[PDB]
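So, can you check?
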Amino acid sequence: MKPEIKASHILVKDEATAKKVKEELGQGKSFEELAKQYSEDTGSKEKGGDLGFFGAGKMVKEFEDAAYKLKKDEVSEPVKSQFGYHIIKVTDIE
């Protein structure tokens, strides 16, 4: 029912590592570079963390809820899911 959004993410094993990734994004490193260096998501770490376009019910609830609260280009605080901790960036909104 929701409009499709496009997002990238960096998946890490713990919250301290997620806060560190978030801080490094403001220290001169790009999201695409940090995804290659830190992300545990094999399917997106080779694509700058891009997950492509998705709508409601495509991603796990914890990820979907956090992503739909972000403004365009906004980077989330650490988001816990069953896969670990995510740093999410919404790159496009309907």
